[model samples]
Target: LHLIPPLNFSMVDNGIFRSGFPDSANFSFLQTLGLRSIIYLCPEPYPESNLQFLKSNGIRLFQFGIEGNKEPFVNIPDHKIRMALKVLLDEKNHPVLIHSKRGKHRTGCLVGCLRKLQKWCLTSIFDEYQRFAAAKARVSDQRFMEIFDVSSFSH
Candidate 1:
């Protein structure tokens, strides 16, 4: 039930949070959540300091390492996104944070799928996506959300 001032963060329903990469200075903000886990959604190597902080605080990490691109037709790994979603949906992983380089498209796609699983309308789902991504939002991501199958998700 804790909350941070939200430097680059958004609450994605329940105990899930979404945000851009956090640096050393952001630890105080992150620490306030008493986060149990982190879902890192990028392919790049994790920053060393961030790793240290997570370990020191006993926070588990679920790394998907998705290769994101801006191309409209690029193949996004729906399977892996679904895998990550499984982790996010677990109650044991409560107070979780999902992040990417900028907390935009990749994060948006996964959260959008989560919204779909929650039976949210497409308009509300896309609205949340665009709120974070702003002008940098991707039609490809929006389309992915539009067509993402939530039947695979277990309730």
Candidate 2:
């Protein structure tokens, strides 16, 4: 039902997630439209003022952090990905809301992996991945690459 331009996209510091509590607003609109329960997938940032706002407005928040690193589609090992996916699917069937700072990289990666596990096409996943980029212009592609660069990473 999330047909809006995706809350997530390709940039590291995507500004869309912070866009006026759009997540909560969308949830409000959806509830008015008769929808129920939202499942947010990223780990809740602490001292969550936004989360309190959502709850005050009657939105439920869920959390499951993905991406041990910032860069997208870097081919992380399947086991770690699987471990994260296990946590997510465990929360399946509940009203779910998933998010990270941008909602694009971390959430996008999580959703994409879930789709693949469900036998969805890689082409569709890639296509979906690009949509977030379109919504928020690239802000830190190089920085993300450098930060997540595995070759130089120790422990």
Candidate 3:
């Protein structure tokens, strides 16, 4: 069984993973992760094929439908992010996977907040965020992460 992880795939922590949305061909590779749940951060419909895979595997789906808009017209609902953060911190949802269309901004901001709770310096968090975003990085997203107060959620 050849194992081929999808592009942009990375383990966020022991039981957490993140990546861009890709074809279902990587299902076998993901199956090996023993994922208990998935966090989808977009407002699009999950493809029927992907739904079938999740149904067959009994993997839970937690979606926070954040719109993917350009930076010039940005206004991310902090409430949604907070809710998603709450879901992320629950141990019952370990071995989780977080994904968005490109796994860039929205996912980056979420993981950046996670890093904050992990006690990572903002500098290191930005480094990681920039690495994933690459050519399409946005300062707006970074700004949101910068001001995101993790004090409310204790690890």
Tens digits of per-residue lDDT for model 3 on 1-155? 68877768999988999998857888999999988899999989999988998898889999999998897888777987888889889989988989998888888989999998999999999999999999989998899999998778974
Name the candidate that leads on lDDT: 3
Model 3: lowest-lDDT 10 consecutive positions:
1-10
Evaluation by lDDT, superior candidate among 1 and 2: 1
Q: Which residue ranges in model 1 land beyond 4 Å of their true spot?
A: 1-7
Estimate, for each residue in 1-155, the C-alpha lDDT of model 1 and write its tens digit: 43443345888888899998888878877888889999999988888999999998899989998886757666778887988999998989988999988888889899999988888999999999999889888888889888887776744
Error of 3 at 2 (Å): 3.0
Better of 1 and 3 by TM-score: 3
Q: Residue 149, candidate 1: how far off, in angstroms?
A: 1.2
Model 3 misplaced regions, further than 4 Å = none
Query: How close is every model to the real structure, measured as TM-score?
Result: 0.92, 0.49, 0.95
CA lDDT scores, all candidates in order: 0.86, 0.43, 0.89
Ranking by TM-score: 3, 1, 2
Candidate 1 is scored at a TM of 0.92
